[PDB]
Design a protein around this ligand. Sequence first.
Ligand SMILES: [Mg+2]
Ligand SMILES: [Mg+2]
Ligand SMILES: [Mg+2]
Ligand SMILES: [Mg+2]
Ligand SMILES: [Mg+2]
Ligand SMILES: [Mg+2]
Ligand SMILES: [Mg+2]
Ligand SMILES: [Mg+2]
Ligand SMILES: [Mg+2]
Ligand SMILES: [Mg+2]
Ligand SMILES: [Mg+2]
Ligand SMILES: [Mg+2]
Ligand SMILES: [Mg+2]
Ligand SMILES: [Mg+2]
Ligand SMILES: [Mg+2]
Ligand SMILES: [Mg+2]
Ligand SMILES: [Mg+2]
Ligand SMILES: [Mg+2]
Ligand SMILES: [Mg+2]
Ligand SMILES: [Mg+2]
Lengths: 81, 151, 111, 99, 98, 217, 141, 106, 37
Amino acid sequence: LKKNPFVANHLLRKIEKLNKKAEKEIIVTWSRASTIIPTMIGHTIAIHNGREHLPIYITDRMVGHKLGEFAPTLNFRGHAK
Amino acid sequence: SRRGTVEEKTAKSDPIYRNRLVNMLVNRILKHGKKSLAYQILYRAVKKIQQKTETNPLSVLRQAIRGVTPDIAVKARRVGGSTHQVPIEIGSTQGKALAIRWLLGAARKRPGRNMAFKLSSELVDAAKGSGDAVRKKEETHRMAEANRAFA
Amino acid sequence: VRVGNVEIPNNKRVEYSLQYIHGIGRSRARQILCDLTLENKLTKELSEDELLQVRDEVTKYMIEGDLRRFNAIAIRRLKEIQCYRGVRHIQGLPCRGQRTKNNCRTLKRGK
Amino acid sequence: ARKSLIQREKKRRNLEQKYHLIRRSSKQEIRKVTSLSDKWEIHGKLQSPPRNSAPARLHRRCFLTGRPRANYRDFGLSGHILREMVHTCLLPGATRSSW
Amino acid sequence: KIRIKLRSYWVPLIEDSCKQIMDAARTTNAKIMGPVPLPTKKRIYCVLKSPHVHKDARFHFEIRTHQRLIDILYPTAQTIDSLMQLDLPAGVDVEVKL
Amino acid sequence: GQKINPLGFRLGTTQSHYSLWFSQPKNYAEGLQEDQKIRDCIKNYVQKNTKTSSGVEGIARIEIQKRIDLIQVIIHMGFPKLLIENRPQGVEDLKINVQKELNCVNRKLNIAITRIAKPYGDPNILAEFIAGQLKSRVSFRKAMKKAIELTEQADTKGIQIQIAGRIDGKEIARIEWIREGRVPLQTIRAKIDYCAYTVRTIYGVLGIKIWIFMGEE
Amino acid sequence: EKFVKSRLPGGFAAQTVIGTGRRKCAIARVVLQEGTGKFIINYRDAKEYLQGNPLWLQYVKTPLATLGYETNYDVFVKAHGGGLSGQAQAISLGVARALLKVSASHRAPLKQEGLLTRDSRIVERKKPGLKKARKAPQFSK
Amino acid sequence: SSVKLILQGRNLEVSDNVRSHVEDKVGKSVAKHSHLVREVDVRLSARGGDLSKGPKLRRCEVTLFTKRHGVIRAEEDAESLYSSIDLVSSIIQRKLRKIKDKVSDH
Amino acid sequence: GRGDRKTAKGKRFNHSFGNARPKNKNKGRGPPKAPIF
RNA sequence: UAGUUGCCAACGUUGAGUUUGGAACCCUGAACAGACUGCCGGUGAUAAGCCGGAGGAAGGUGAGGAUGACGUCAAGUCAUCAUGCCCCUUAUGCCCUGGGCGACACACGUGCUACAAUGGCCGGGACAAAGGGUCGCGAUCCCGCGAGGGUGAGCUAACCCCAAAAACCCGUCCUCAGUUCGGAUUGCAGGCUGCAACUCGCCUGCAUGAAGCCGGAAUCGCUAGUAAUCGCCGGUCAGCCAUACGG
Ligand SMILES: [Mg+2]
Ligand SMILES: [Mg+2]
Ligand SMILES: [Mg+2]
Ligand SMILES: [Mg+2]
Ligand SMILES: [Mg+2]
Ligand SMILES: [Mg+2]
Ligand SMILES: [Mg+2]
Ligand SMILES: [Mg+2]
Ligand SMILES: [Mg+2]
Ligand SMILES: [Mg+2]
Ligand SMILES: [Mg+2]
Ligand SMILES: [Mg+2]
Ligand SMILES: [Mg+2]
Ligand SMILES: [Mg+2]
Ligand SMILES: [Mg+2]
Ligand SMILES: [Mg+2]
Ligand SMILES: [Mg+2]
Ligand SMILES: [Mg+2]
Ligand SMILES: [Mg+2]
Ligand SMILES: [Mg+2]
């Protein structure tokens, strides 16, 4: 609490840029360690795993957590298959 | 070893009773390298034996070693023939330490509140014929007389 | 039901007998006595007014009920939202950076 | 221990000293100002310098071989090559040990 | 009251220089408290022999630092000229004032 | 099957360090950098000034001796006159060669080149005299035999020579050595000099380990 | 306490009878003196400093148990390092050394009983590749 | 029977037809003294031909630990993979029979 | 024992600090124990 | 022999800092001596040596270590480095972001913590060594239950700090119970390092309290301050997955 959460500038600008318009402008990102401020609520964001970007819709119960928790990059279904 | 000449260790005695038998009895109690705790196990026991028997605990301890000491054992050999177990005698020093292992061994196994109580009831019972260590003497002594013939 | 909808033994001390309650650990058991500044006597020998004074103060914390519900909803929060940590609960696997190659017999056994 | 990596580290050495003093000013600026009041700006332009100028991103290598492991800050060389220098009479006071 | 500390790695080298501090100062009228050797430090270092798995094979080495302490009293102009004029060996690192 | 380097085995009593200086542990590493930058540029200097002969192309030993505001360097050779006396500015250009990387006006340095008593008594030039023949592929045993016959003039008591690698161009390497006199490695009291040298052949590379027993002491 | 400082005017340095023993990284600066048969360590009682361990009280006394002088002298000592066993048994040598200066005639009972023999055995060093000085690690063949 | 098995692709991949050939051979040599051993170690290797310089050669290293302080070390080399497995199995059956002859010496 | 981090035996093994293994006397021992007559 | 940054004593503001006397104690580091079957007995081929007194701190190699012959395994490393030949030069090279090296039915090993009463929790009191440290180690004091956050005395270190050594002694309680044994797993709330802590760091405060009652066939270490057992330090290091490694 002594410091603010981590939110990159390249992401913060794009999020703040769209609040003026208030419309879907589906966007790609790369920083998985970014915290979800409630200003990016109702938007849809694509998070870069090892391979590609994963568009995910933002829910009100995602605020305190970061983006990377929802973007898996291990890709394991079953064993010996 | 292959030398056959093992040095004779300096058998020490305790401060109070000033006998070497007691110090040999203590060295088998500890297992983590601490001696101050064994006397709290011992000095509470011999005091407890005196509390029950109304006599010196030294004679009761000297009698227990005198009764449990088998002075004979059986060892396996196959230098001639297969699966032979003929008897073999025991010296004075060997039989002395050999009885301490059986007493403290049975004391740890039997139930009780603490090692001082487990040790007290062992020596008092062992001196009076009936003792778990005395049973092992009978079992070991049985195998000797059973295989009395050298075969 | 001695206190808090649980039958506690009557032979143990007070400090090390409230701990059987699902919401009372080792520190909370001491904080209650220290707030009431009473002596840690036996469980059965305790007076009625003093034991009454415990029954009113223990209910202030998340003792039982809402405690187990406050947790289960929290684990349910991660499952429906599909966090990384939420999927591992569904898989019956840990979520705090453990290695899963040769350990974790607790959760693998608790399938 | 490729040649490009050794020059790649020299790149980070120069960028650090280039952007050294302003970071101390920013580490003191971020410690004084109240949260949610210019703090995102302070931490904001804390990201704008090159990440290659960070001290934590450094990695000590051997002065000769450029090896990324077994380094010693008192010597600056890797353990293997440093061993040979002890034997062939180049280091003062570095004698074999037995205690 | 000029307290001088000097440190070095070599025993026959530092003893020679310590003799020169006395020789340069004994000619001048000034008393000297004798040299008091402080406890010597020893920087142990461990390294592997091979560049491969051979772990039990290790090579320890040390760097022994022999330090000495000498102090003068009642300094003079003739004294200070005698100390600076004196030449030292290579392996000595004098510390003239603390 | 690995023998310790005898130099490291006798640093305490018999053998001395060829770099006499001192600094704090924080600056101990920087001093070694200054030493190597000196020791390396001498080789780059002597290599280029000389026509790459089988003689005085290399040197014997370098000794650095530092002091506050002085760095006393002492190069050791068997025949300094081949590449020092021929050029009067050659000895001077060496100082400019070092002074660029050394420091500004402060911390100057003087350097001397002392003649060793026996130019072949040491193993340094004795290895290079051999290596000059292996590059010209004179023969294997002749260079090993001629070296032993040469050091008798240098009044040596014992010597041992070892060569490893590819010799006859075969697809397999070999290790051949020879000993003369007495060369006790396990005797700390004795004085033994040691040197290792590499020879870049058109195929592969060779290695030359030499031991020279000079005095029981 | 002020009591020990009253008997010693300048400390254990400016005294005649002295004993200096050492065992297992411990030091014992012993000073004998005519007294009433007491035994104090570092301005603190023996049983308070030794925690009532009977043997550690024995070792400091067996130099004095011989010759029947357990009542004539009062023994004041010091300690620098090591544990209570080393400090106690180092004092056993120190108390022995000081009795020699009282009279060199009775050196033999102290020697024949084996008290002046400084037990020079020290904790062994840990070797590389081993868990202890001799404990080798386990490995499956 | 009731004995485990360990293969190892040292320098190549372990196929299925090969694995069937392994179990067939040591299954014969070990089935005799099956009540003395618990496991079977195997390590296949390949060298030469197109992989490395020199003649193509395939090694088969086989170690065996019995139930009573028994150790066996077997290593052979052949031009083919199956031929290497065959020769080693003959060596195990030779030494494995040597043990019983010593235990049953009476 | 040593695995129980919340005890002084565990803090010493893990080299951490808290109510169990304090740094000095003035640190927090928030819950004390009651007397026993 | 030398006497401080250490040792002995006097003084007390005080035990954070000072002053005075002593070199007689102890330690620190130079230089020497001391241990060689040297002396006596027995035995011995009139030998080597062997068994024993004595003396001495130590006696038969005083204890420990470095130390590793000719050679063996075409043993190991081309990824410390250096290297012959071969191979890729709009890629087998060059720079960055993110991910991965931390995934997981299982199997094979090395270790850690335990199954408790020779024990466990709390309170009080004691006793070490070797190391590390000026962009550093950080005292005292003030905040927070706490991790930590402010002030920054001293210490280039025989001065100061890291730094509380723990086992152990005294006293209260727990009385053989999956327990006041055991501390895995998970949630919540916080702190520090750092541009960055989701995958993937270390810690605090609480609450949860798995398996496990000394362990098959088999199998390892250790012959003295050893094994067993207790804790401390360091290196790499912003930080640390270190229960490791070296002391
Ligand atoms: Mg509870
Ligand atoms: Mg780093
Ligand atoms: Mg050889
Ligand atoms: Mg030591
Ligand atoms: Mg290991
Ligand atoms: Mg191994
Ligand atoms: Mg517990
Ligand atoms: Mg930890
Ligand atoms: Mg507080
Ligand atoms: Mg090979
Ligand atoms: Mg290989
Ligand atoms: Mg290479
Ligand atoms: Mg290459
Ligand atoms: Mg590639
Ligand atoms: Mg790995
Ligand atoms: Mg992973
Ligand atoms: Mg169970
Ligand atoms: Mg039980
Ligand atoms: Mg087990
Ligand atoms: Mg042995």
